[PDB]
Structures are given as structure tokens and as C-alpha cells.
Design a protein around this ligand. Structure first.
Ligand SMILES: CCc1nc(C(C)(C)C)c(-c2nnn[nH]2)c(-c2ccccc2)c1-c1ccccc1
Length: 135
């Protein structure tokens, strides 16, 4: 086993969000997509198979999935339709996901806190915090 498995693997459901509309504005998401996506209560399904980590997002708005190896950059087409270059690392027990596109950057951190998975999303000075619980 591993730290990664013990901490993050499982099925997680959104239970609270703060500042996500403002984070989405900063990223460039348009009005209609922000309103519909902001209603969603996604599940985040995290699994590990050898070196490969998969993070699946399921919702009423969009379903997507990424698979990756830590430290190894990959192309991601995000659900808000950005074509980004992503790298995900494990730094001090936190999964740190950086997305680069059009000379911009955003960082998404996933951390365990108590029985929750806390996701912090930062674009310029805007931070959104999304809290997920085990399904
Ligand atoms: C900005 C892009 C974005 N980023 C996230 C984070 C990784 C950063 C948190 C998520 C999200 N994924 N799981 N939970 N939340 C979603 C989202 C996923 C499904 C439903 C609603 C929101 C969106 C997003 C996707 C499509 C349109 C607009 C936003």
C-alpha cells in the first residue's frame, strides 16, 4: 500500500462550496456554464492502480476523468472546455494539480482533513474551497 491509497482512494461527494463562482469567473467560465455547473454536486472517484492515479468526476452537468503518473505532465481537456497542460504531484501529503493554458495558471490542491477531502482551487488571488465526504 501507500500514503496515496490510504489518504485519497475512494468515492467522495460534494457537501459544501465557497467562492466557486468567483473562481470560475477568474478562470474564464461564461455565465450559463457557471450557473449550471455551480448547481452540481459532483462525486470525485479516486483510484490507484500501480503508478497510475485516476480521478473521475461524475455529475449531472458533465462526467470526466483524468489518469496520470505523479510528476509527469499530460494534456487535459477540462469540462469547462479549456485545453490545458497538467502536472500533478504529491507534496507533503497533498495532491497538487497545476493547469497551464494561454499563459495562465491555476492550482488545485486536494488534502485530507479529518474525514473530509478538501479541495482548494486558486486562480490569481481567488481561492475556492470545496469540501467532500465519503459516499
Ligand atoms: C473550473 C473547472 C471545474 N473545476 C473543478 C475542480 C476540479 C477545480 C474542483 C470542478 C469539480 N470537479 N469535481 N467537483 N468540482 C468542476 C466541476 C465538475 C463537475 C460539475 C461541476 C463543476 C469544474 C467545472 C466543470 C465544468 C464547468 C464548470 C466548472
Amino acid at each position: 500500500g501507500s500514503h496515496m491509497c490510504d489518504a485519497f482512494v475512494g468515492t467522495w461527494k460534494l457537501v459544501s462550496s465557497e467562492n466557486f463562482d468567483d473562481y470560475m469567473k477568474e478562470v474564464g467560465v461564461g455565465f450559463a456554464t457557471r450557473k449550471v455547473a455551480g448547481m452540481a454536486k459532483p462525486n470525485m472517484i479516486i483510484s490507484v492502480n500501480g503508478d497510475v492515479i485516476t480521478i473521475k468526476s461524475e455529475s449531472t452537468f458533465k462526467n470526466t476523468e483524468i489518469s496520470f503518473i505523479l510528476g509527469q505532465e499530460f494534456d487535459e481537456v477540462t469540462a469547462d472546455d479549456r485545453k490545458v497542460k497538467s502536472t500533478i504531484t504529491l507534496d507533503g501529503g497533498v495532491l497538487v494539480h497545476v493547469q497551464k493554458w494561454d499563459g495562465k495558471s491555476t492550482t488545485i490542491k486536494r488534502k485530507r482533513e479529518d474525514d473530509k477531502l478538501v479541495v482548494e482551487c486558486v486562480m490569481k488571488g481567488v481561492t475556492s474551497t470545496r469540501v467532500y465526504e465519503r459516499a
